Amino acid sequence: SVLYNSASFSTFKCYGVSPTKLNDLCFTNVYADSFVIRGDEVRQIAPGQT
Amino acid sequence: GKIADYNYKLPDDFTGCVIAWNSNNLDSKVGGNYNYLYRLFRKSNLKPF
Numbered sequence: 783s784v785l786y787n788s789a790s791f792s793t794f795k796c797y798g799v800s801p802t803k804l805n806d807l808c809f810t811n812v813y814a815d816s817f818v819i820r821g822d823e824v825r826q827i828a829p830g831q832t
Numbered sequence: 833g834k835i836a837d838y839n840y841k842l843p844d845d846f847t848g849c850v851i852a853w854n855s856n857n858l859d860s861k862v863g864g865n866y867n868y869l870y871r872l873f874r875k876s877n878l879k880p881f
């Protein structure tokens with residue numbers, strides 16, 4: 783919570799889990815990806831979205 | 833969204849609608865307009881209205 787509150791990311795939306803609830807749940811071995819894309823593609827990453 | 837969004841929160845049910853229109857020649861000051869203020873931090877969420 784406090785992490786993304788300060789960072790002020792422009793694009794942020796979470797699927798299948800609420801961002802406010804994220805502090806409560808417990809996971810196993812969270813992954814993290816990272817790359818750089820063109821502007822249009824930033825509005826083009828989503829599950830089942832061609 | 834951001835805390836500015838969380839300052840004005842609509843109910844889950846809402847009858848009516850919003851109207852938004854551009855304002856570049858009146859609300860923009862060449863020397864810098866700073867009369868508008870927004871909220872960036874708060875204790876918790878807000879009830880609708």
Ligand SMILES: *[C@@H]1O[C@H](CO)[C@@H](O)[C@H](O)[C@H]1NC(C)=O
Binds near residue numbers: 789
């Ligand atoms: C960049 O990394 C530093 C590491 O000390 C961090 O403090 C800062 O918040 C980061 N900037 C962001 C997340 O915008």
